[PDB]
Ligand binder design. Structure first.
Ligand SMILES: [Zn+2]
Length: 864
């Protein structure tokens, strides 16, 4: 079974009111629904999705005539006018290892419903264009489950004489079933509040374990920031007087925006400086913001169908990005998002699972919570902002809400709202949603006369879903530098400025930048104005100039990225020839300039000193030997490490001074620590023996987790026994903190040491490891699958190990398994020896009886 966007049809039935009663016992939970159903197409059979154990079904208080086959319950004889359906289901939440539906975690109960987990609770029209008003009653043992939560306002509750108690929750906003949530547990609460701009207090409650409560303060501060920001930046106010956040350690996603009752992975909720890195704090601030931003972009306006996922995800990611950039370090953060997209989304678009931002089909919708839908989705939203500017973007947002508040709509609708509010034609912009693959821009420039003439071609490769790719609407932001690197003004079109957005809409166009009175090197795709590959013929000196003198963060960073890539290309050549490594004189000059430049933002400096990953390096290659790319990248890194050894120590010391013993999170102190950790990595590459000095002063240096993490990352590939000793000590020190234990397993899995496979196999049996925990599985096994020299070992050991775990995990958590199996996505592009072994691994996975639809869809994309 495949679902096709072209087959969309409005539902035959609407659900007006959904009344739910939960009776929680050991081990069984019994769910009783009362659905108020309104016929849209009278006389059609009523079709309900559901997979929980079915105990009874009634239409109007009388047992229904029905058939249940697979996960579809059908009632043929339904009234022609409003009627009720009552379903009784029974759940065993402690047996739910999929972490979808109602499930146990740490002795408490939690739900995850998006996209299709609610049908695992009760039989329902489980699709997002069906919106209903939910009221939830919950009965449970008071001592075991003192905390009983669902969406909305708590309107009643009481006690029973037998030790049980109940609550009743009313969510007055119509919602799709994927936004339902329930929590039952023995949990601690942290209370705070926000007062909206119209003067309404909103009580804030974060629920955690009793032990995790001291780590929740930063998330609370982040939420309040997010709430104020949505008001100041978007004019958006919260709509209830209560907002709850519940942390859970067993969770497949990062977090979930269920109305007024968000449920979060602990990793995006808990921090203190002793146990969490600066990046962890940054993540909490983004995701806390993200989920709150969904209250409007996803909840108040939702998705007509799951093909439209990016309507809420692309828009909400853009929102969280803008929130984080407005907080601090806009340019550095933009670069980080760009780097992420290029390192993870670009390979997706170049591979067998590539898809449009709005897919035309899917077998399993869990497989589409993807870098493309989220991050490329955000780049697509950002292009509206680039084309329209802030005021125009905000006009679009206002009309979007005016038109669609209370509706389940499509990407077309958001486009139309942006188009209409600004009096502009964005018909061609629709191809950003329907065409997969990364566009390639072929660029050439000429200064003839006083005119700089930039010619630009575009194509987009076929992808497995679609061969035909038409020209797209691509904004190219540009500037021009003279031979001393300063800004050169130009005319276009009628305006005299130092920067312009060139709107490419045709297969090929020439842009005339007129009135140019000096020799120029152009700066192109400024701010990463469109998510594309751009090829302009730059010389090494052109790149050095851009890197030294350009006013744009992205274009400066891109020039360094290009220099590193050419260096690695030059290493690949000499290593293939069996000759000495290249000298890299110009690159080393450029890097010296960066190390020694004190006008550079610390965190921006750190990015400029980062070398593109192996996947970036083999982008566009065939017959890839991943170990040859690894060796070449490693060589470059070691050359940089050794060449500038005493200068890495010096930068390290300069950063230490400037951090000034300010160990708590702040974006300012974080910038210096980021730089410090880059220097640490280089130092330990050049002088592995420095590990014993580090070990001797470890306590002294371990002033927060950013430092411990940065030290341990720096020494992680070191073949000294001291590296194993430091890891063991870390595990012992933080044995009681599950989120720090995640870091430990990530270090185990990610190590470039020769013995990583056997240490990973030992780690499977560590008392703190749990295969059934998504954070643990990803930390250990996920990191191994990404560990280039080990995953792609020539003997196939890495492929067999990962396939073994995809098989084993898929027996309880298809979502974790389907993500993990994508480590094999490079298959077709590998050299023949490895390719053969990968295809064997995937065939073996395919041969498993009972293989999930999730993993089967991916394997089929890679294999067939
Ligand atoms: Zn989201």
């Amino acid at each position: 079974t495949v679902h096709y966007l072209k087959d969309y049809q409005t539902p035959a039935y609407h659900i007006l009111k959904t009344d739910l009663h939960f009776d929680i016992n050991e081990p069984q939970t019994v769910v009783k629904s009362r659905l108020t159903v309104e016929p849209q197409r009278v006389g059609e059979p009523l079709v309900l999705d559901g997979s929980a154990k079915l105990l009874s079904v009634k239409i109007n208080g009388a047992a229904a005539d029905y058939v249940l086959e697979g996960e579809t319950l059908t009632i043929a004889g339904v009234p022609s006018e409003r009627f009720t359906v009552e379903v009784e289901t029974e759940i065993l939440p402690a047996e739910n290892k999929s972490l979808m539906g109602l499930y146990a975690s740490g002795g408490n109960l939690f739900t995850q419903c998006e996209p299709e987990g609610f049908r695992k609770i009760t039989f329902y029209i489980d699709r997002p264009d069906v919106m209903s008003k939910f009221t939830t009653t919950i009965v449970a043992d008071k001592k075991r489950y003192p905390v009983l939560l669902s969406n909305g306002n708590k309107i009643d509750g009481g006690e029973f004489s037998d030790g049980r108690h109940w609550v009743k929750w009313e969510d007055p906003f119509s919602k799709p079933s994927y936004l339902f949530a329930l929590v039952a547990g023995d949990l601690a609460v942290t209370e705070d509040y926000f007062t909206t701009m119209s003067g309404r207090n909103v009580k804030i409650e974060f629920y955690t374990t009793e032990a995790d409560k001291p780590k929740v303060g930063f998330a609370v501060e982040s939420l309040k920031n997010a709430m104020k920001w949505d008001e100041t930046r978007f004019g958006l106010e919260y709509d209830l007087d209560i907002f709850m956040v519940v942390a859970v350690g067993d969770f497949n996603m990062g977090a979930m925006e269920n109305k007024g009752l968000n449920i979060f992975n602990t990793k995006f909720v808990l921090a203190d400086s002793r146990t969490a890195t600066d990046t962890d704090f940054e993540g909490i601030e983004s995701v806390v913001g993200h989920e709150y931003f969904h209250n409007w972009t996803g909840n108040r306006v939702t998705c007509r169908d799951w093909f439209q996922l990016s309507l809420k995800e692309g828009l909400t990611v853009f929102r969280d990005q803008e929130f984080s950039g407005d907080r601090a370090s806009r340019a550095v953060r933009r670069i980080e998002n760009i780097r992420l997209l290029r390192q993870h989304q670009f390979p997706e678009d170049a591979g067998p699972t590539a898809h449009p931002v709005r897919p035309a089909s899917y077998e399993e919708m869990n497989n589409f919570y993807t870098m493309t839908v989220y991050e490329k989705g955000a780049e697509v939203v950002r292009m509206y902002h680039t084309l329209l500017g802030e005021e125009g973007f905000q006009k679009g947002m206002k009309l979007y809400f005016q038109r669609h508040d209370g509706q389940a709509v499509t990407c077309d609708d958001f486009r139309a709202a942006m188009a209409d509010a600004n009096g502009i034609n964005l018909d061609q912009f629709a191809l950003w949603y329907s065409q997969a693959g990364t566009p390639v821009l072929e660029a050439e420039g000429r200064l003839k006369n006083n005119i700089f003439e930039l010619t630009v071609k575009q194509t987009v490769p076929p992808t497995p879903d679609m061969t035909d790719k038409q020209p797209m609407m691509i904004p190219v932001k540009v500037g021009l530098l003279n031979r001393n690197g300063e800004a050169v003004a130009f005319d276009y079109q009628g305006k005299r400025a130092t920067e312009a957005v060139l709107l490419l809409t045709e297969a090929e166009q020439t842009f005339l930048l007129e009135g140019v009175t000096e020799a120029v090197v152009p700066s192109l795709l400024r701010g990463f104005s469109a998510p594309v590959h751009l090829n302009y013929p730059y010389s090494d000196d052109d790149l050095l100039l851009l890197l030294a003198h350009d006013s744009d963060a992205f274009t400066r960073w891109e020039a360094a990225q290009t220099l590193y890539r050419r260096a690695v290309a030059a290493n690949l050549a000499t290593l293939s020839d069996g000759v000495e490594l290249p000298k890299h004189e110009k690159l080393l000059a450029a890097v010296e300039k960066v190390i020694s430049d004190d006008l550079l933002d610390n965190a921006f400096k750190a990015l400029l000193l980062g070398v593109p990953s192996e996947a970036e390096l083999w982008d566009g290659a065939e017959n890839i030997d991943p170990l040859r790319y690894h060796q070449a990248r490693e060589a470059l890194l070691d050359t940089l490490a050794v060449h500038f050894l005493p200068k890495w120590h010096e930068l390290n010391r300069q950063a230490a001074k400037q951090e000034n013993q300010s160990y708590e999170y702040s974006p300012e102190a974080a910038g210096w620590r980021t730089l410090r950790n880059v220097c640490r990595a280089f130092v330990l590459r050049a002088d592995p023996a420095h590990i014993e000095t580090v070990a001797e002063k470890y306590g002294e240096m371990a002033q927060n987790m950013t430092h411990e993490w940065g030290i341990l990352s720096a020494v992680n590939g070191n073949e000294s026994d001291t590296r194993n000793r430091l890891l063991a000590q870390f595990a012992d020190k933080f044995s009681d903190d599950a989120l720090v234990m995640d870091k430990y397993f990530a270090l185990v899995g990610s190590s470039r040491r020769s013995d990583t496979l056997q240490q990973v196999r030992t780690a499977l049996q560590h008392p703190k490891f749990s295969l059934e925990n998504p954070n643990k599985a990803r930390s250990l096994i996920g990191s191994f699958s990404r560990n280039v020299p080990h995953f792609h070992a020539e003997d196939g050991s890495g492929y067999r190990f990962i396939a073994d775990k995809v098989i084993e995990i898929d027996r309880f958590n298809p979502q974790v398994a389907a993500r993990l199996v994508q480590a094999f996505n490079l298959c077709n592009k590998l050299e023949p020896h490895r390719k053969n072994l990968v295809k064997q691994a995937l065939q073996r996975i395919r041969a498993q009886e009972g293989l999930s639809k999730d993993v089967g869809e991916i394997v089929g994309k890679i294999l067939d």
